[PDB]
PDB file of C-alpha atoms in Angstrom:
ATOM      1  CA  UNK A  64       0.000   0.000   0.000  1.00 53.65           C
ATOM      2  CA  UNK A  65       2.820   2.578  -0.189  1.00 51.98           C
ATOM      3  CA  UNK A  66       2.990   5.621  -3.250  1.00 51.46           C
ATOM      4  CA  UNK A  67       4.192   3.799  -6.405  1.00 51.92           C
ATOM      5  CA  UNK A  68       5.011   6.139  -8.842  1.00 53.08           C
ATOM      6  CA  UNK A  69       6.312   5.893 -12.687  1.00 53.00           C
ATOM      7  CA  UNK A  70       7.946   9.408 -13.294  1.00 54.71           C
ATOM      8  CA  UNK A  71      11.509  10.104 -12.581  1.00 53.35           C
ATOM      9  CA  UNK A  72      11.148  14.017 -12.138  1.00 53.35           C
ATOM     10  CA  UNK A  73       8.524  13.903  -9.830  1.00 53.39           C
ATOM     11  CA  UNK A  74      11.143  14.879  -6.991  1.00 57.68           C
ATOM     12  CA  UNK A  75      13.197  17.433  -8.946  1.00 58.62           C
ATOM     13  CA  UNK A  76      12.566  20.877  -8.235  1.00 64.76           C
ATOM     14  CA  UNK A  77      15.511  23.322  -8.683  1.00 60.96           C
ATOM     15  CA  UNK A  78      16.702  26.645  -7.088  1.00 57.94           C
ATOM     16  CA  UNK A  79      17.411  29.928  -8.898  1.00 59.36           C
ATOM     17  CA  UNK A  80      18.269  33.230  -7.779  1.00 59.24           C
ATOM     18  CA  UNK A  81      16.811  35.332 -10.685  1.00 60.02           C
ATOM     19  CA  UNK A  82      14.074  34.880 -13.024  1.00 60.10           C
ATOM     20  CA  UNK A  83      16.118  35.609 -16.016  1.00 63.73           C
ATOM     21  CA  UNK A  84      18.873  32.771 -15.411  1.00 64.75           C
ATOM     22  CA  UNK A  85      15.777  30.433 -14.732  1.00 64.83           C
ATOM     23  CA  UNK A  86      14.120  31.376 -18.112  1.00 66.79           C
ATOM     24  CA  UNK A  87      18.024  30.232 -20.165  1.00 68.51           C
ATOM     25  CA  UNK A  88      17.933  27.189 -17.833  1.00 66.56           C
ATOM     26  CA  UNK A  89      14.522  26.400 -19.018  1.00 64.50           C
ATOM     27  CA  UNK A  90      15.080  27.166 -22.665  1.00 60.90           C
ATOM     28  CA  UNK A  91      18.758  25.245 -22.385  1.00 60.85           C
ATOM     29  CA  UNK A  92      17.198  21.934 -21.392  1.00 57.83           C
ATOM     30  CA  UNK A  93      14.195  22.013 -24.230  1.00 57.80           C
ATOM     31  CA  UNK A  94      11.505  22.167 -21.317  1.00 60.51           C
ATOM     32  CA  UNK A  95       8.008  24.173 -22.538  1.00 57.15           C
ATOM     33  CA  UNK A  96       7.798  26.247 -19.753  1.00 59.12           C
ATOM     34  CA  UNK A  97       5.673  28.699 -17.981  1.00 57.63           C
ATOM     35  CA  UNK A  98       6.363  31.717 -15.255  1.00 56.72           C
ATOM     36  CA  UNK A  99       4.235  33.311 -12.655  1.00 60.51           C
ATOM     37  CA  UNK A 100       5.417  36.357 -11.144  1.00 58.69           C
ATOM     38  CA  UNK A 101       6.307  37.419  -7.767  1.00 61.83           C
ATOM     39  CA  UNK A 102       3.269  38.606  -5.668  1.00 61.84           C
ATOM     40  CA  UNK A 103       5.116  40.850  -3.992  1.00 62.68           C
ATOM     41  CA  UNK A 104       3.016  41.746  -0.535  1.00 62.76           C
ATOM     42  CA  UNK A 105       1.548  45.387  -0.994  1.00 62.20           C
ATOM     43  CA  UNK A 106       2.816  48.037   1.357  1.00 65.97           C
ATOM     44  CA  UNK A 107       0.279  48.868   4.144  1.00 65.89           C
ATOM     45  CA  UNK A 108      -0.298  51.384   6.191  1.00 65.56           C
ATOM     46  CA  UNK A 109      -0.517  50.829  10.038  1.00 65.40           C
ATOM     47  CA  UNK A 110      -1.304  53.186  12.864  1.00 63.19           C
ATOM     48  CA  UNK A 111      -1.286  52.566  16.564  1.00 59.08           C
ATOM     49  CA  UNK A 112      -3.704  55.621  17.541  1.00 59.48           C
ATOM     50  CA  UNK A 113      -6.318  55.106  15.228  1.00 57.06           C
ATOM     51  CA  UNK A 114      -7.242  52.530  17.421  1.00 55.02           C
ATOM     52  CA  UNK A 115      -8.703  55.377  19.615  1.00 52.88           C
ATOM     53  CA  UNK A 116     -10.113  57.408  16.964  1.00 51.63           C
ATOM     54  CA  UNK A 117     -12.267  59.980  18.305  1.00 46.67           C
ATOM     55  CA  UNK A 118     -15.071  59.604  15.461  1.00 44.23           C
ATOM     56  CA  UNK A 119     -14.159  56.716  12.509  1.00 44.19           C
ATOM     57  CA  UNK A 120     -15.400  54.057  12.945  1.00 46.01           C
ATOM     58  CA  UNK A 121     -11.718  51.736  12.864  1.00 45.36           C
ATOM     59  CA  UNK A 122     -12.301  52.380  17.150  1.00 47.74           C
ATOM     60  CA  UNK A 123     -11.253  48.682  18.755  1.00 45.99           C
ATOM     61  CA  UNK A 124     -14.406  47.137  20.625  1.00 45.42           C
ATOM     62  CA  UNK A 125     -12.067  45.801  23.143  1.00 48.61           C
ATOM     63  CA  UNK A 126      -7.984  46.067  24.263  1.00 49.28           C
TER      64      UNK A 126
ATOM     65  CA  UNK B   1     -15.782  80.332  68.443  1.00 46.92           C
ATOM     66  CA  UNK B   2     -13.007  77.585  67.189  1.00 42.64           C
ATOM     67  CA  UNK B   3     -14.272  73.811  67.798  1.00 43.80           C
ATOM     68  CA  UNK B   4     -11.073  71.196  67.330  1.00 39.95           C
ATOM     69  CA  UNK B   5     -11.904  68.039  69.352  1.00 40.21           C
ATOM     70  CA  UNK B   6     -15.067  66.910  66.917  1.00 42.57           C
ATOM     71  CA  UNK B   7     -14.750  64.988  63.809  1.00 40.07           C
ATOM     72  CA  UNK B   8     -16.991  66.836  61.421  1.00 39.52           C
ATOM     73  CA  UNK B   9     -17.481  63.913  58.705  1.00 40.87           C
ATOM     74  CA  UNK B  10     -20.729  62.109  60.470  1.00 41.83           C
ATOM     75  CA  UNK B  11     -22.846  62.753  57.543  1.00 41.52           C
ATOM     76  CA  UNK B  12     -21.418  59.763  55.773  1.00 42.87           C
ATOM     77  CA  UNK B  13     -22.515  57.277  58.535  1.00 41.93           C
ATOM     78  CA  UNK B  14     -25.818  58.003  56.814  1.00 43.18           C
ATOM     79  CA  UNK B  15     -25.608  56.809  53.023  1.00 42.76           C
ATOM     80  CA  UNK B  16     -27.997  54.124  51.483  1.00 43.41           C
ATOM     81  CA  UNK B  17     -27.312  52.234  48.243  1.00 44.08           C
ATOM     82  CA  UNK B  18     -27.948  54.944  45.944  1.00 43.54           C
ATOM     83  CA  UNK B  19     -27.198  58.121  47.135  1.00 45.53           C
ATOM     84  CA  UNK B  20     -24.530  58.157  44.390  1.00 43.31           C
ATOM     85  CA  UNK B  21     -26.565  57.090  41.624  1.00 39.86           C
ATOM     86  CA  UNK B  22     -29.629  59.618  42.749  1.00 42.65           C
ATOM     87  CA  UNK B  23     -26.853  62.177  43.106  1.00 42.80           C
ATOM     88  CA  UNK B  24     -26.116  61.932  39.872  1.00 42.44           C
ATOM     89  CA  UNK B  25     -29.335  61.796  38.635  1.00 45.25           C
ATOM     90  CA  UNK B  26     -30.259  65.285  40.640  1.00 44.31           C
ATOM     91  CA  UNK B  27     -27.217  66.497  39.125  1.00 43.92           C
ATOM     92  CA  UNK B  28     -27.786  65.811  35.480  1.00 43.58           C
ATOM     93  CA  UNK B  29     -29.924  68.851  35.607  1.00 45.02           C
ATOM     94  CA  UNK B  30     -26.922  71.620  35.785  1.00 42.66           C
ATOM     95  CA  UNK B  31     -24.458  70.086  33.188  1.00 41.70           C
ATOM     96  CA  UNK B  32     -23.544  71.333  29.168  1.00 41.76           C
ATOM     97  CA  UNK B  33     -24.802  69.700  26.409  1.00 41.10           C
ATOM     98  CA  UNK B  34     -22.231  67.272  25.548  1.00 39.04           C
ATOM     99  CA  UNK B  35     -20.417  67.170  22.266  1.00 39.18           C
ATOM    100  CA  UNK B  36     -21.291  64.831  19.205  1.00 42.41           C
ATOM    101  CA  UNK B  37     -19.049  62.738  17.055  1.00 41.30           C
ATOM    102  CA  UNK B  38     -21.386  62.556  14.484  1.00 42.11           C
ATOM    103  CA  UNK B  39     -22.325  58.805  14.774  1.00 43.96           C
ATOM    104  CA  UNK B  40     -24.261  56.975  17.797  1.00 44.83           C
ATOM    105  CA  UNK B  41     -21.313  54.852  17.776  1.00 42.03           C
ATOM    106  CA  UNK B  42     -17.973  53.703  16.419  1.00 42.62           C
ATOM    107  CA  UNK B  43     -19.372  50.470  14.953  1.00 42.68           C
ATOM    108  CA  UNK B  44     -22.153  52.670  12.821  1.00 42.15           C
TER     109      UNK B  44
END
């Protein structure tokens, strides 16, 4: 009952530092390829005292 | 005259339950209107 499997490159997965260098590695070897880019987190904007805003409504129900 | 052997505070040997609440209650009476935010509450 254990996983038999049949493809060899099921545990390959490689390590680049750039996206460009991965792109000429890809291309070297003849593999059809596709690239998803980096979701990069969004910079937010955080404030300690409007926690305690006198009249908007982002007051904290409890502390 | 000058008294300086009595302790003056007796009156508070003679408080019930709510002679702070119906203190504040008679006292509502002589206070400003207060100011408004604009909302009944924060989670409006």
């Amino acid at each position: 009952g254990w996983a038999s499997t049949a493809d060899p490159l099921s545990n390959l997965v490689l390590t680049f530092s750039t996206k460009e260098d991965a792109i000429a590695f890809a291309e070297k070897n003849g593999w059809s390829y596709d690239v998803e880019e980096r979701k990069v987190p969004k910079p937010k904007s955080k404030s300690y005292g409007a926690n305690f805003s006198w009249n908007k409504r982002t007051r904290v129900s409890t502390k | 005259p000058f008294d300086n052997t009595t302790y003056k505070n007796l009156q508070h040997h003679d408080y019930s339950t709510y002679t702070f609440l119906d203190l504040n209650l008679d006292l509502s009476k002589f206070r400003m209107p207060q100011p408004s935010s604009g909302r009944e509450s924060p989670r409006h």
